[PDB]
């Protein structure tokens, strides 16, 4: 005891590979930034933070009626799980021009799945 089993790095790879790489941008864009190049845009920009695997942008209907408002939700698959907590240090909280950014780590089996709404 005393940090023997964290010396002997015990059960460390196995909680390593259930972190969740995802991160989730909440509502930072509006739809009419969703252009042909955005996703690549998010990709580039998310290579400051980490090898990027996969970029999903989801315009997520809140409501069930013909115009329902969108919020637009980006997430981004990162290699590894501390690549995604650099992207948030440095991501939420700002300010993208008048919107304040929310970036937060989104559940791996729920992404896995396409399950987006969360």
């Given at each position: 005891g005393s940090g023997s089993s964290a010396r002997h790095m015990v059960m460390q790879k196995l909680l390593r590979k259930?972190?969740?790489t995802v991160m989730?941008?909440?509502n930072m864009v509006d739809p009419k930034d969703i252009d042909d190049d955005l996703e690549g845009e998010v990709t580039?920009?998310?290579g400051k933070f980490g090898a990027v695997n996969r970029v999903i942008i989801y315009q997520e209907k809140q409501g069930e009626e013909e115009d329902a408002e969108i919020i637009?939700?980006?997430?981004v698959e990162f290699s590894i799980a501390?690549?995604?907590?650099k992207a948030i240090q440095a991501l939420n909280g700002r300010w993208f021009?008048?919107?304040?950014?929310?970036?937060?780590?989104?559940?791996?089996?729920r992404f896995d799945n396409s399950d987006l709404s969360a």
């Open positions: 259930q972190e969740s989730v941008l909440r580039e920009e998310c637009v939700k980006i997430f501390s690549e995604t907590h021009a008048g919107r304040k950014v929310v970036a937060e780590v989104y559940d791996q089996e």
